[PDB]
Amino acid sequence: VIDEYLERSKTNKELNDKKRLATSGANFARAFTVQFGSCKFPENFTGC
Amino acid sequence: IGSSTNLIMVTSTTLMLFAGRFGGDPAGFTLADTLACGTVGHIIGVGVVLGLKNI
Amino acid sequence: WVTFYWHWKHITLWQGNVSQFNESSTYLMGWLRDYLWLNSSQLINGYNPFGMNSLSVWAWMFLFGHLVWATGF
Amino acid sequence: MRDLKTYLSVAPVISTLWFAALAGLLIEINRLFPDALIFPFF
Amino acid sequence: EVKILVDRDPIKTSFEEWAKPGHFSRTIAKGPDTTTWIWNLHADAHDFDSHTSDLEEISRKVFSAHFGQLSIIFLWLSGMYFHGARFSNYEAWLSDPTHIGPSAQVVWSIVGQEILNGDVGGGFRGIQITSGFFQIWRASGITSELQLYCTAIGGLVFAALMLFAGWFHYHKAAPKLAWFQDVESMLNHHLAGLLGLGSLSWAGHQVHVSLPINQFLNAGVDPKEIPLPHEFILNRDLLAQLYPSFAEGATPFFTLNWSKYAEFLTFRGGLDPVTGGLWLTDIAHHHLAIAILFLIAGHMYRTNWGIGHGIKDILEAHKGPFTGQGHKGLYEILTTSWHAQLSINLAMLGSLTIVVAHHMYSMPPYPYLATDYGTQLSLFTHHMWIGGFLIVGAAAHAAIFMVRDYDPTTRYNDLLDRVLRHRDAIISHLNWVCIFLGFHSFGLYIHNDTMSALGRPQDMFSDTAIQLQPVFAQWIQNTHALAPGTTAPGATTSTSLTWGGGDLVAVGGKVALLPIPLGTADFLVHHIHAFTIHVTVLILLKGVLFARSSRLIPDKANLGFRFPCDGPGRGGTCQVSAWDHVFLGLFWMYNAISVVIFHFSWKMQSDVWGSISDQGVVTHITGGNFAQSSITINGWLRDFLWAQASQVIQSYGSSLSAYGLFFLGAHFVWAFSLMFLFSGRGYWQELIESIVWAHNKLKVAPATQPRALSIVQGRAVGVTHYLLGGIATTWAFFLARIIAVG
Numbered sequence: 001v002i003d004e005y006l007e008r009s010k011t012n013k014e015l016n017d018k019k020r021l022a023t024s025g026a027n028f029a030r031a032f033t034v035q036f037g038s039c040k041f042p043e044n045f046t047g048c
Numbered sequence: 049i050g051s052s053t054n055l056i057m058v059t060s061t062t063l064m065l066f067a068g069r070f071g072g073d074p075a076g077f078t079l080a081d082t083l084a085c086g087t088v089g090h091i092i093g094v095g096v097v098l099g100l101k102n103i
Numbered sequence: 104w105v106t107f108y109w110h111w112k113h114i115t116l117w118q119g120n121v122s123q124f125n126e127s128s129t130y131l132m133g134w135l136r137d138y139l140w141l142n143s144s145q146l147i148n149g150y151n152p153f154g155m156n157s158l159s160v161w162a163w164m165f166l167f168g169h170l171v172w173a174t175g176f
Numbered sequence: 177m178r179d180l181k182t183y184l185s186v187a188p189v190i191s192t193l194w195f196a197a198l199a200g201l202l203i204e205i206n207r208l209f210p211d212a213l214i215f216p217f218f
Numbered sequence: 219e220v221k222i223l224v225d226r227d228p229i230k231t232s233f234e235e236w237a238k239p240g241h242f243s244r245t246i247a248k249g250p251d252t253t254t255w256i257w258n259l260h261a262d263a264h265d266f267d268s269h270t271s272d273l274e275e276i277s278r279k280v281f282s283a284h285f286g287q288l289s290i291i292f293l294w295l296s297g298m299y300f301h302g303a304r305f306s307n308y309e310a311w312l313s314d315p316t317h318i319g320p321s322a323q324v325v326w327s328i329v330g331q332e333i334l335n336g337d338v339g340g341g342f343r344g345i346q347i348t349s350g351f352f353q354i355w356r357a358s359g360i361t362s363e364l365q366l367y368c369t370a371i372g373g374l375v376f377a378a379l380m381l382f383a384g385w386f387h388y389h390k391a392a393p394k395l396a397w398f399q400d401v402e403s404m405l406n407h408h409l410a411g412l413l414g415l416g417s418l419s420w421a422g423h424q425v426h427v428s429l430p431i432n433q434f435l436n437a438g439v440d441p442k443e444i445p446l447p448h449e450f451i452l453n454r455d456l457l458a459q460l461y462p463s464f465a466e467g468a469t470p471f472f473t474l475n476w477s478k479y480a481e482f483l484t485f486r487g488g489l490d491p492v493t494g495g496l497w498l499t500d501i502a503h504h505h506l507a508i509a510i511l512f513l514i515a516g517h518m519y520r521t522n523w524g525i526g527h528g529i530k531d532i533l534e535a536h537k538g539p540f541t542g543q544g545h546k547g548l549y550e551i552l553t554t555s556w557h558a559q560l561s562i563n564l565a566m567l568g569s570l571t572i573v574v575a576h577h578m579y580s581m582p583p584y585p586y587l588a589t590d591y592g593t594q595l596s597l598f599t600h601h602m603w604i605g606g607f608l609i610v611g612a613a614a615h616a617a618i619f620m621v622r623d624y625d626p627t628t629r630y631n632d633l634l635d636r637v638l639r640h641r642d643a644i645i646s647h648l649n650w651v652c653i654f655l656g657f658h659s660f661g662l663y664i665h666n667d668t669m670s671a672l673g674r675p676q677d678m679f680s681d682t683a684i685q686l687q688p689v690f691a692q693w694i695q696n697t698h699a700l701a702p703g704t705t706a707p708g709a710t711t712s713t714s715l716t717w718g719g720g721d722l723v724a725v726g727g728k729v730a731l732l733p734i735p736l737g738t739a740d741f742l743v744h745h746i747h748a749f750t751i752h753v754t755v756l757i758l759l760k761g762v763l764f765a766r767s768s769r770l771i772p773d774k775a776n777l778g779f780r781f782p783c784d785g786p787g788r789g790g791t792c793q794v795s796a797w798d799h800v801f802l803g804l805f806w807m808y809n810a811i812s813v814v815i816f817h818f819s820w821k822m823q824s825d826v827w828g829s830i831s832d833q834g835v836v837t838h839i840t841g842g843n844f845a846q847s848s849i850t851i852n853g854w855l856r857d858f859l860w861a862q863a864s865q866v867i868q869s870y871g872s873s874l875s876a877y878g879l880f881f882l883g884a885h886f887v888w889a890f891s892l893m894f895l896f897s898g899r900g901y902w903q904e905l906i907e908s909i910v911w912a913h914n915k916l917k918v919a920p921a922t923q924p925r926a927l928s929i930v931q932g933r934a935v936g937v938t939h940y941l942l943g944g945i946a947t948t949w950a951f952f953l954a955r956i957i958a959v960g
């Protein structure tokens with residue numbers, strides 16, 4: 001609001017959408033992890 | 049100290065307490081009565097001060 | 104049920120396309136969408152805020168019937 | 177232990193356990209074999 | 219005096235009572251002779267007043283049930299927060315709230331249901347939610363998922379604490395009867411402590427946490443660059459840069475020169491242009507004022523000290539022109555039975571819920587809430603239904619009290635006797651009012667339909683032929699529009715944009731709010747609403763008043779509260795109990811609420827919601843056809859039911875397909891209900907006889923002889939199925955339409 005944080009956001013505009021997309025993809029894949037192949041019957045013990 | 053608001057609030061609180069006294073004490077005046085009188089005096093003082101400042 | 108089946112089959116046969124009944128009659132949503140909702144468009148437009156046509160009386164009777172049905176309840 | 181075992185044998189609890197086991201077995205069978213319309217083993 | 223009184227270990231915790239079902243009632247505990255026993259075991263489970271007669275046990279059971287309910291609610295809240303934290307696109311929606319649809323549920327991939335994972339937006343696939351939780355989280359200042367996880371953990375902990383508290387207060391230290399009968403202390407603590415302190419703490423949170431974070435977000439700062447909430451508390455320089463008043467500290471508050479806090483405590487009103495919601499400073503100011511008011515009002519009743527008021531003294535010393543001695547023995551009645559309190563609280567809660575729905579739709583308090591149409595529609599309909607159900611239940615509990623807890627010898631009240639002595643005039647007048655209102659309200663519509671069907675559009679009651687305008691409502695609207703100019707100099711603008719007069723507010727190319735016109739259609743629909751409400755009131759009042767006795771049956775109180783009839787004599791005495799009156803009034807409540815929600819939906823879609831181009835023209839969803847098509851029944855059937863059902867029936871093969879399936883399923887359930895409402899028990903019993911013979915032939919006869927359902931059970935099943943089917947149909951239709959088109 002002091003236009004310094006706005007300038008910080010403009011400088012770091014990139015990779016922020018990347019982080020958001022990565023978080024959304026992880027949230028979606030939390031249901032398809034088994035169908036993907038990872039988190040199979042082994043290593044479910046205290047995992048995922 | 050010495051401002052108009054301080055004098056107004058002090059006068060209101062003292063007058064309310066004095067009125068509440070009559071109409072270890074010679075006349076039964078427990079701490080609850082003093083607290084209620086002080087609170088009502090403070091309410092009245094705040095009201096009158098804010099009314100006067102708002103003109 | 105019998106009259107619904109007869110009317111739908113014959114109306115599709117007359118309209119020139121028989122694939123509609125052959126395809127949409129195997130599930131009930133097809134019955135609800137391709138028979139009642141589709142064919143009621145001309146009936147419900149008997150009278151509108153703009154005007155009316157010769158079907159108007161039938162439309163009235165339509166609504167009339169509904170009322171009586173509810174009164175039975 | 178006797179009273180807890182007696183309670184666990186009441187009708188709703190046994191019914192929910194049986195139906196949960198059946199649903200799990202059916203879901204796992206349908207997962208291992210995705211689609212089935214005819215019996216092809218013969 | 220006021221004291222803490224408890225009993226140590228009234229009951230012992232053991233599993234021996236779990237093994238034997240129906241231990242509360244001896245008749246149930248004896249054993250199952252037929253199947254009806256099972257149906258009874260669930261009916262009398264929560265009727266604590268029938269298990270025993272001592273008030274102490276009933277009060278303790280009520281307290282424990284309240285604790286368990288609180289634990290369940292906390293578990294539900296924790297689950298919602300955990301779903302928001304883990305499976306959601308909250309972080310993606312935070313940056314671009316206008317172009318992303320909220321979603322917090324993910325469906326598995328077992329059968330083929332993966333088509334339900336729609337493209338909500340932000341690189342996510344899932345079911346779009348309409349709970350409005352994202353707006354609440356944004357208004358609270360949450361910008362990450364770790365905070366949501368912590369909130370979920372805290373909710374789990376609090377649910378466990380509530381369950382342990384319930385167990386402790388039933389099995390270890392149970393309060394005595396005198397503890398519950400102290401209403402003055404309870405009122406003082408609920409007013410000053412539960413309400414004032416909570417609102418004060420929330421106002422403090424809003425002042426310290428919500429306002430700076432929301433200001434940074436509204437400025438345009440990226441959510442990942444905003445300082446953490448505790449940085450504002452730790453660093454006074456940041457707050458001084460944001461709000462200079464904080465640089466002075468708490469000195470102004472004690473100095474009584476409160477104007478210095480005018481930066482973050484304002485009285486402007488209206489909607490915020492950026493987010494289309496109320497100002498957060500106004501909300502904090504309102505919470506502070508409400509906290510002050512509740513804290514002041516919480517010290518009215520005398521408890522343990524000289525100062526205060528006595529409720530009994532206030533009631534007894536009341537003198538008036540129309541009342542007289544009046545309220546003399548009401549204190550004992552209210553402090554003796556639970557049912558009267560339950561009825562009063564139920565009615566008040568229902569009315570409050572309806573008021574909440576109205577105030578929430580009128581003035582949106584959350585950011586980016588007005589432009590999300592599905593959330594608004596869902597909130598309005600849900601709150602209306604909840605309020606209606608509570609209002610219905612109030613009358614049933616009032617009838618229960620009047621039936622089983624009323625005796626004019628030990629506890630006599632003059633007002634109740636006076637009301638009970640002239641019930642015939644009340645019932646007759648209410649019946650006449652209902653008949654007159656219904657005749658006029660529906661005859662207007664029937665006349666319009668008949669005149670339009672005969673090619674006579676100049677004889678109808680419309681804005682063009684015969685005008686019936688709501689002059690009083692228009693006068694009130696004009697007064698409210700002109701209110702802030704002279705009558706309320708403190709406010710910069712009016713409270714709401716609904717009042718005729720002002721400007722249009724739109725956020726992100728979508729209309730947020732604009733003044734709502736009023737015409738003949740609003741007149742007709744308002745009168746229909748009044749007619750339905752009056753009929754429901756008539757039914758409930760007739761049920762309540764004639765519970766003890768009637769001209770037809772002079773001893774109805776001996777039979778009880780839940781009895782089917784008295785017999786085939788006297789011409790027929792079916793459905794004479796108050797339970798039947800409640801079961802009949804449920805239908806009319808359903809009808810009234812359905813009409814209200816239909817009116818709200820059509821009017822909002824036709825006259826308010828829409829889109830705006832760059833030039834400045836506004837295109838509404840249905841193009842303003844409410845004022846000319848809603849004056850006839852055919853218009854309601856064609857332009858609302860037929861036209862707006864296109865989306866639900868065409869949703870197959872898409873992400874909305876589930877809704878369509880529900881649109882069918884509910885229908886089925888509705889029809890099913892008819893089977894329980896048009897038939898009787900004897901036919902089913904006679905059929906079960908032959909079925910039992912066929913079973914007996916093959917040696918598969920059960921010891922518990924099958925029996926047909928009782929009459930009351932059949933009526934309850936029918937009404938439950940009817941209500942469930944209708945409500946689910948409306949839910950599916952509304953959600954499908956508002957998600958596909960908005």
Ligand code: CLA
Nearest residue numbers: 656657658659660661662663664665666668669676677678
């Ligand atoms: C239920 C309400 C209702 C009402 C109010 C109206 C009203 C109207 N209709 Mg419609 N109509 C209705 C339903 C209704 N209709 C229905 C259900 C149908 C059948 C489908 C029709 C079919 C219909 C037709 C076919 C026609 C109309 C037409 C008309 C008009 C004719 C009025 C008239 O000539 O007689 C009025 C007669 C009176 C004797 C008035 C009695 C009421 C008085 C004022 C009592 C007031 C009481 C007072 C306060 C008492 C206090 C006592 C105190 C002093 C001590 C009128 C505007 C006619 C038209 O052409 O109009 C444009 C027409 O041809 N109507």
Ligand code: CLA
Nearest residue numbers: 280281284285288397398400401403404405407408411412
């Ligand atoms: C100022 C303290 C105080 C507070 C905060 C409350 C608050 C509450 N009381 Mg009341 N009550 C008080 C004094 C207080 N009471 C006194 C002195 C009496 C005796 C006259 C009663 C008699 C009473 C009864 C008989 C009942 C309640 C109930 C309730 C709950 C209402 C449910 C609800 O509205 O959701 C609001 C939800 C929340 C805010 C949950 C937060 C949890 C709170 C903060 C727990 C801490 C409260 C407790 C008083 C303090 C702990 C003391 C202990 C550790 C020694 C709520 C937790 C009803 C209830 O639901 O029962 C469980 C109920 O049946 N109260």
Ligand code: CLA
Nearest residue numbers: 260261262263264265266607608610611612614618800938
């Ligand atoms: C605020 C809370 C509240 C409370 C504590 C009570 C308390 C009480 N009520 Mg009242 N009541 C309320 C609100 C409340 N009521 C409301 C809102 C209504 C209007 C509907 C009523 C109408 C009412 C009636 C008509 C009766 C009572 C009676 C009773 C007593 C018996 C309770 C019982 O045995 O149920 C135990 C629980 C059940 C029998 C469960 C029934 C199944 C429900 C109906 C299904 C709902 C399904 C779900 C929502 C949909 C999903 C489907 C899915 C499961 C597949 C009990 C003292 C009864 C009595 O005998 O009083 C002396 C009685 O006859 N109440």
Ligand code: CLA
Nearest residue numbers: 170173174176649652653656657660661664753757802805
């Ligand atoms: C849609 C069908 C339907 C209709 C029309 C009615 C109608 C009515 N109900 Mg019933 N009811 C129904 C279904 C229906 N119910 C269902 C499903 C239930 C659930 C069991 C109930 C349960 C029920 C209860 C519990 C109560 C009623 C009551 C009433 C009356 C309300 C008073 C009033 O508005 O009268 C005004 C008249 C009308 C709205 C009816 C239509 C009249 C139009 C305008 C035509 C008039 C035209 C003209 C005169 C005809 C002449 C032509 C002829 C000469 C050829 C009214 C007779 C209440 C009651 O009787 O108290 C007064 C009551 O307490 N009903």
Ligand SMILES: CC1=C(/C=C/C(C)=C/C=C/C(C)=C/C=C/C=C(C)/C=C/C=C(C)/C=C/C2=C(C)CCCC2(C)C)C(C)(C)CCC1
Nearest residue numbers: 061062065082083084085086087088090091092094510514
């Ligand atoms: C004479 C004498 C004496 C003295 C005494 C005294 C001194 C007493 C008291 C006094 C007083 C003087 C008291 C009181 C005070 C005060 C108070 C108690 C206050 C309170 C307040 C409040 C509570 C407030 C509140 C509020 C707020 C916070 C905000 C706004 C609103 C209001 C206002 C509400 C002696 C014993 C020494 C000796 C002998 C003689």
Ligand SMILES: CC1=C(/C=C/C(C)=C/C=C/C(C)=C/C=C/C=C(C)/C=C/C=C(C)/C=C/C2=C(C)CCCC2(C)C)C(C)(C)CCC1
Nearest residue numbers: 292295296368369370371372373374376415416418419420
């Ligand atoms: C969301 C949520 C949660 C959380 C919560 C929280 C976090 C809370 C907090 C809370 C708080 C944190 C509160 C606080 C409060 C406070 C208060 C209430 C205060 C008061 C004060 C006062 C009253 C004062 C007074 C005075 C005066 C007037 C003057 C001078 C002196 C003195 C200072 C004394 C959980 C997880 C649980 C669950 C789920 C949901």
Ligand SMILES: CC1=C(/C=C/C(C)=C/C=C/C(C)=C/C=C/C=C(C)/C=C/C=C(C)/C=C/C2=C(C)CCCC2(C)C)C(C)(C)CCC1
Nearest residue numbers: 291292294295410411412413414415416417418419420574
């Ligand atoms: C409507 C509803 C809801 C919601 C609810 C809520 C949101 C609530 C809240 C609540 C709250 C929000 C509460 C609060 C409370 C608070 C309190 C209770 C406080 C207390 C405090 C205290 C106790 C303090 C103390 C102190 C201190 C610490 C310092 C100074 C001194 C003194 C002593 C004053 C739901 C969704 C569930 C559903 C159903 C219905």
